[PDB]
């Protein structure tokens, strides 16, 4: 989706995460590696605002 679309349709603008976390099976002795989709990570604009559910939100620092 694009930024304009997201705000218009109230969807969060975010990026997908695909990791192929495959090392080895339990007892089959055969590596079964599959690119699993863990979730979505929000993206920040160049100005610093992230659009979540159609609402521009900011993150304030802390001391």
């Amino acid at each position: 989706i694009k930024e304009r679309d997201a705000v218009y349709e109230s969807l969060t603008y975010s990026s997908e995460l695909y990791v192929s976390a495959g090392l080895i099976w339990k007892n089959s002795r055969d590596m079964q590696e599959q690119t699993i989709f863990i979730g979505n990570i929000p993206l920040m604009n160049s100005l610093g605002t992230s659009i979540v559910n159609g609402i521009y939100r900011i993150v304030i620092n802390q001391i």
């Binding site: 695909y18 192929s20 599959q34 690119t35």
Partner: peptide
């Protein structure tokens, strides 16, 4: 899509 998913489906 055309690379990782293709290599996973083919191999």
């Amino acid at each position: 899509e055309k690379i990782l998913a293709k290599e996973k489906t083919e191999e």
